[PDB]
Amino acid sequence: GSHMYLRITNIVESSFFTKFIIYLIVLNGITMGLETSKTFMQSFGVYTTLFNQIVITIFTIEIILRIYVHRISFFKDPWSLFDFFVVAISLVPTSSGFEILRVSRVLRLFRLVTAVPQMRKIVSALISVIPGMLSVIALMTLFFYIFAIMATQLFGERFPEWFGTLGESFYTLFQVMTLESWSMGIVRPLMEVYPYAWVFFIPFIFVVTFVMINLVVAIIVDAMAILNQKEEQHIIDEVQS
Amino acid sequence: GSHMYLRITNIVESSFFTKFIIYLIVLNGITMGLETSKTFMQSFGVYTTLFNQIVITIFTIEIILRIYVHRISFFKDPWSLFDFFVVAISLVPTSSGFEILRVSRVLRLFRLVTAVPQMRKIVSALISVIPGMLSVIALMTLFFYIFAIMATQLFGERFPEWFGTLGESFYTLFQVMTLESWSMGIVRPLMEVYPYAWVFFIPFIFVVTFVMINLVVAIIVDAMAILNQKEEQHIIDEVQS
Amino acid sequence: GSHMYLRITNIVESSFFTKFIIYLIVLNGITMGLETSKTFMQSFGVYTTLFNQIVITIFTIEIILRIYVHRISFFKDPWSLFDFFVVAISLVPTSSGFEILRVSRVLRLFRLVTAVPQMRKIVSALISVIPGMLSVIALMTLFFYIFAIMATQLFGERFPEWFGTLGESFYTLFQVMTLESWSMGIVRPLMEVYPYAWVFFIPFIFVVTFVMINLVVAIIVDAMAILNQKEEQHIIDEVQS
Amino acid sequence: GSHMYLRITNIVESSFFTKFIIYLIVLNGITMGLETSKTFMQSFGVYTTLFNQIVITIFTIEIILRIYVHRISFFKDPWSLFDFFVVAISLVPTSSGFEILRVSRVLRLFRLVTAVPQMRKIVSALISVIPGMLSVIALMTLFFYIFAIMATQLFGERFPEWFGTLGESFYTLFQVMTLESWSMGIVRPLMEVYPYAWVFFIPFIFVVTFVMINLVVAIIVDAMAILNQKEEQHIIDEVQS
Ligand SMILES: CCCCCCCCCCCCCC(=O)OC[C@H](COP(=O)(O)OCC[N+](C)(C)C)OC(=O)CCCCCCCCCCCCC
Numbered sequence: 018g019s020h021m022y023l024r025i026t027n028i029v030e031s032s033f034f035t036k037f038i039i040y041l042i043v044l045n046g047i048t049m050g051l052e053t054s055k056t057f058m059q060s061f062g063v064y065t066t067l068f069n070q071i072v073i074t075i076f077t078i079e080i081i082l083r084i085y086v087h088r089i090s091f092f093k094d095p096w097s098l099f100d101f102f103v104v105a106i107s108l109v110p111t112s113s114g115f116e117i118l119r120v121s122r123v124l125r126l127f128r129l130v131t132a133v134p135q136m137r138k139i140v141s142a143l144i145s146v147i148p149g150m151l152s153v154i155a156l157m158t159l160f161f162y163i164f165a166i167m168a169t170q171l172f173g174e175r176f177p178e179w180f181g182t183l184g185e186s187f188y189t190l191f192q193v194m195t196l197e198s199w200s201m202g203i204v205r206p207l208m209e210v211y212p213y214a215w216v217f218f219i220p221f222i223f224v225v226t227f228v229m230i231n232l233v234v235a236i237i238v239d240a241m242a243i244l245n246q247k248e249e250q251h252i253i254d255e256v257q258s
Numbered sequence: 259g260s261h262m263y264l265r266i267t268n269i270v271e272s273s274f275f276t277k278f279i280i281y282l283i284v285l286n287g288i289t290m291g292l293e294t295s296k297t298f299m300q301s302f303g304v305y306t307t308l309f310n311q312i313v314i315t316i317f318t319i320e321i322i323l324r325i326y327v328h329r330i331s332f333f334k335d336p337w338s339l340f341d342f343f344v345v346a347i348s349l350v351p352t353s354s355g356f357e358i359l360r361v362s363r364v365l366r367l368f369r370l371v372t373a374v375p376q377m378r379k380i381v382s383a384l385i386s387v388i389p390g391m392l393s394v395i396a397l398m399t400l401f402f403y404i405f406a407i408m409a410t411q412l413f414g415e416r417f418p419e420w421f422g423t424l425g426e427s428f429y430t431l432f433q434v435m436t437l438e439s440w441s442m443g444i445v446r447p448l449m450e451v452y453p454y455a456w457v458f459f460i461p462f463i464f465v466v467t468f469v470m471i472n473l474v475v476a477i478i479v480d481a482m483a484i485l486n487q488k489e490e491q492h493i494i495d496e497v498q499s
Numbered sequence: 500g501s502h503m504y505l506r507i508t509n510i511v512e513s514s515f516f517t518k519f520i521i522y523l524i525v526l527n528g529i530t531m532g533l534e535t536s537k538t539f540m541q542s543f544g545v546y547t548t549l550f551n552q553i554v555i556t557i558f559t560i561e562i563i564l565r566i567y568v569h570r571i572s573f574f575k576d577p578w579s580l581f582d583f584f585v586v587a588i589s590l591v592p593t594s595s596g597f598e599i600l601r602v603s604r605v606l607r608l609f610r611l612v613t614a615v616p617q618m619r620k621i622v623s624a625l626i627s628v629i630p631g632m633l634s635v636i637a638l639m640t641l642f643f644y645i646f647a648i649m650a651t652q653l654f655g656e657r658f659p660e661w662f663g664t665l666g667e668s669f670y671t672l673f674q675v676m677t678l679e680s681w682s683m684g685i686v687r688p689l690m691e692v693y694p695y696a697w698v699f700f701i702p703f704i705f706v707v708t709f710v711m712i713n714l715v716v717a718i719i720v721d722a723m724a725i726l727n728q729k730e731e732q733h734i735i736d737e738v739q740s
Numbered sequence: 741g742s743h744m745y746l747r748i749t750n751i752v753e754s755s756f757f758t759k760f761i762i763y764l765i766v767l768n769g770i771t772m773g774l775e776t777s778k779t780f781m782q783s784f785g786v787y788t789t790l791f792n793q794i795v796i797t798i799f800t801i802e803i804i805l806r807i808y809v810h811r812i813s814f815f816k817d818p819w820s821l822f823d824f825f826v827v828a829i830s831l832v833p834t835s836s837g838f839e840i841l842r843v844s845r846v847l848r849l850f851r852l853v854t855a856v857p858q859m860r861k862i863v864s865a866l867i868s869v870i871p872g873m874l875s876v877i878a879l880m881t882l883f884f885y886i887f888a889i890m891a892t893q894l895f896g897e898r899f900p901e902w903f904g905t906l907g908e909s910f911y912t913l914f915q916v917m918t919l920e921s922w923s924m925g926i927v928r929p930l931m932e933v934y935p936y937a938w939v940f941f942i943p944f945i946f947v948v949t950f951v952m953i954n955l956v957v958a959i960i961v962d963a964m965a966i967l968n969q970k971e972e973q974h975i976i977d978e979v980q981s
């Protein structure tokens with residue numbers, strides 16, 4: 018806090034700043050979707066490859082700026098910690114072989130979420146219900162793990178594509194949980210060899226399904242036992258006073 | 259408003275009018291479903307091709323009439339703006355090659371919704387919940403867009419049917435969202451070439467699913483935090499008075 | 500009402516009666532499931548074919564009896580009107596070619612629902628929510644009908660198995676509504692010929708899905724705006740008195 | 741209750757005890773997942789086969805101990821009755837041919853549920869909603885049974901894989917209930933021979949679906965008519981006093 022600090026802070030904290038970024042984002046958003054056509058890249062492919070590190074430099078400056086204005090507060094903000102890591106990726110140079118990072122650059126278009134406050138709101142609402150589910154996700158993951166281990170031991174030797182491995186079996190059990198091809202694609206083939214295999218997967222389909230449904234019912238029915246306490250408290254008070 | 263205006267207004271606004279239309283609709287409804295059989299069209303196919311522009315002329319008159327009675331109010335009514343556009347299509351002449359318009363004529367059977375007030379009610383109820391979802395639809399569409407761009411770049415070269423293009427990838431990601439063949443039909447083929455592809459689509463299946471469920475829970479649990487404010491307000495008042 | 504009438508009424512209305520029937524039902528239930536094995540029918544197949552019209556005669560008597568005791572009240576009771584029609588079928592003689600009626604006999608095992616009061620309760624609960632949905636089922640059926648007509652006209656010539664006919668198209672559109680193979684099995688084949696076919700089925704999948712979800716939300720959120728009126732009425736009263 | 745009894749009781753009831761078990765569990769959990777790789781078992785396969793009956797003996801002692809401390813109370817506790825039966829299996833010797841029991845040993849990893857109180861909580865919540873559903877599960881199972889019998893009689897001769905048998909038909913009807921391949925995989929093949937087969941499976945798909953949805957709505961809407969009685973009772977009381 019001083020003369021020079023405050024000068025920057027008023028740039029960074031301005032609405033022009035955030036809108037310039039939001040524009041860059043929507044602009045580089047469109048550019049990244051045009052960068053998708055081989056036709057376009059043969060023609061205008063240099064313009065957008067240059068338009069790209071333009072936005073990357075701007076976003077780096079813009080991040081640098083925000084870290085000066087916000088100090089340690091910046092690395093405790095989940096919203097901006099994101100932009101940090103998402104612009105960080107987009108800075109790793111395109112020449113190192115690893116395809117996964119060149120494509121990671123598109124993750125910068127998620128700044129439109131952190132930048133726009135209406136978007137931040139939804140994400141925070143959606144994220145907010147996760148912490149209560151951690152217990153049930155742990156139970157479910159344990160349940161998957163126990164069953165993935167059993168299926169490997171039961172079906173992996175004859176059915177190695179689907180169950181040869183703790184991971185192949187995790188994958189198949191998830192597919193079964195999504196109910197996708199679970200009978201025609203998986204369990205019926207299984208039963209030509211293991212006639213009682215339906216005794217494994219139907220109860221799995223029952224339990225995994227039952228938990229999913231209850232999880233939702235618990236959310237709804239618990240989210241509104243709370244509104245019914247608040248409201249009686251506000252009703253008990255006006256009948257006393 | 260005058261002698262001549264009021265004469266028409268009493269025709270248009272009558273219940274005979276709306277019922278005559280509702281009858282024409284249900285009648286041309288049935289005719290359009292009989293127009294479906296080649297057998298029937300070989301025999302009675304002229305009767306119904308003529309019965310058709312009969313209804314079209316009537317409906318045009320009927321629309322003309324309603325515009326005189328209702329003035330500028332007509333082009334601010336969503337319900338009637340529809341019948342306008344839906345009869346407008348049915349007027350474009352059958353001879354111009356474009357198959358899409360000849361079939362559009364069946365959209366006139368949706369006038370049974372605008373005509374019948376019980377139907378209008380449901381549609382308005384269903385439409386009414388959309389405006390609050392616009393934020394989440396925007397988030398989801400952005401999310402699809404970011405992922406459609408990544409998948410094109412990741413899988414389009416080897417898997418051009420499913421991911422060769424921003425649109426092919428949109429399509430596949432929607433199919434994956436519907437969970438249809440997502441593992442047997444898509445992700446398992448993908449993994450013969452891209453062993454880690456499950457790292458893209460499971461989290462996509464998780465996020466897209468999670469949002470869908472939360473959207474519903476939000477509707478229910480928010481639609482009824484409101485009833486719990488109204489009711490305490492009506493309870494706080496009678497304990498004060 | 501008299502000496503002779505009352506004698507029968509006390510048989511019919513007894514608990515021994517209903518339990519004898521409930522036993523016959525569970526007994527003929529088991530018999531009808533054993534009648535399923537060719538092995539068993541080669542051995543004991545006469546015992547159960549005779550055990551069958553035994554139960555049929557008993558059930559006819561039992562129905563006759565109940566009609567005397569209950570008079571016109573019997574043909575206004577949905578529960579017993581059922582047993583009437585379900586035993587009526589089981590009386591039509593096995594020799595007339597029509598396979599559909601021989602198998603209809605198994606419908607008598609549904610008397611265990613009408614007989615047992617715990618069962619009647621659920622069915623009445625489940626049936627009870629249907630009447631409010633009649634509007635939306637009508638809207639949906641109209642919507643299917645309009646779209647089934649369009650799809651026949653659009654895809655039936657090249658794709659006659661799936662869309663050759665108003666009924667083939669109804670069937671496919673339902674399958675699409677269940678999301679079953681909708682993309683791999685139907686819409687993707689369609690698009691090799693009709694590249695824009697996704698413009699028909701995605702919006703269909705959107706609308707049909709949207710309505711389904713809203714129907715449920717409406718049930719829940721409306722079933723409990725009522726409990727919130729009852730309860731404020733009971734709360735407003737005790738604050739007045 | 742005495743000097744010697746109390747000495748053991750203070751071991752068993754200690755937190756060190758339960759944590760030692762919880763550690764053994766998570767340790768043997770990891771071991772059972774490593775026991776999955778043929779690579780690992782070629783190397784360290786003896787260490788973990790020995791680490792296994794180590795844990796089994798400990799768990800037997802640990803169970804013996806708990807039965808002394810808890811007396812008849814132990815065989816009335818569902819939580820510990822489980823560990824009993826789950827360690828009991830793991831004690832049956834690996835040499836008797838029956839593959840099903842060697843794999844059952846993994847069920848011991850479910851002790852992490854009974855051991856950890858956060859886990860016990862969820863399971864008890866989830867289990868708690870089952871008793872009210874027993875009626876509807878009975879109705880559904882009856883409904884399946886009636887339909888499984890009809891389908892065997894209707895489609896089993898031509899379609900023995902799917903409907904040759906009361907059990908094959910149960911299986912298929914469940915698959916149809918999960919909607920998995922129900923049209924492409926089952927009903928469409930059926931209709932090449934039985935053109936009206938859609939008259940069996942669509943109503944089955946309707947009823948079975950309808951019940952599922954209503955079951956959930958009943959849970960939610962009934963779980964919270966109760967909160968609305970409790971809260972008015974607590975509101976009626978403070979307006980009287
Ligand atoms: C009861 C409490 C339990 C708590 C502990 C849970 C965590 C234990 C982790 C154990 C990891 C075991 C890894 C493992 O076995 O790797 C298997 C394979 C590699 O097999 P590999 O040895 O390469 O090939 C063997 C030869 N072959 C090809 C002929 C079969 O590679 C794979 O399949 C990948 C490994 C996937 C691991 C998934 C871990 C899920 C964690 C769930 C935690 C639940 C907590 C509540």
Ligand SMILES: CCCCCCCCCCCCCC(=O)OC[C@H](COP(=O)(O)OCC[N+](C)(C)C)OC(=O)CCCCCCCCCCCCC
Binds near residue numbers: 042053055397400424
């Ligand atoms: C971060 C903020 C982002 C905001 C901006 C979002 C809108 C950007 C629109 C970009 C449109 C890009 C269109 C495009 O690249 O067309 C691709 C293809 C035509 O490819 P084409 O050049 O014919 O063929 C190349 C050669 N080949 C066949 C060998 C591959 O044709 C297609 O694939 C059809 C184009 C489908 C466009 C779908 C647009 C979805 C908009 C989502 C908006 C989300 C807002 C929150």
Ligand SMILES: CCCCCCCCCCCCCC(=O)OC[C@H](COP(=O)(O)OCC[N+](C)(C)C)OC(=O)CCCCCCCCCCCCC
Binds near residue numbers: 288638640666667
């Ligand atoms: C806008 C208001 C509308 C209100 C009226 C709705 C009811 C209209 C009923 C019209 C019935 C039309 C029947 C019809 O066209 O039959 C078509 C086929 C028989 O075709 P066919 O003439 O044997 O074969 C022609 C030659 N071929 C094989 C080369 C194509 O056979 C079939 O496809 C069976 C017919 C299925 C009829 C389904 C009716 C659904 C009613 C939905 C009502 C919604 C009300 C809100």
Ligand SMILES: CCCCCCCCCCCCCC(=O)OC[C@H](COP(=O)(O)OCC[N+](C)(C)C)OC(=O)CCCCCCCCCCCCC
Binds near residue numbers: 525536539885907
């Ligand atoms: C209306 C009240 C009803 C209450 C009673 C319900 C229980 C009745 C149980 C009847 C059990 C019938 C067993 C049976 O028939 O076994 C059939 C097959 C064995 O056939 P099999 O004789 O080996 O082979 C015949 C020759 N072949 C291969 C050429 C066809 O093997 C199988 O398919 C396995 C048997 C599966 C039985 C599933 C039982 C479900 C119980 C549902 C109870 C609902 C209660 C509300």
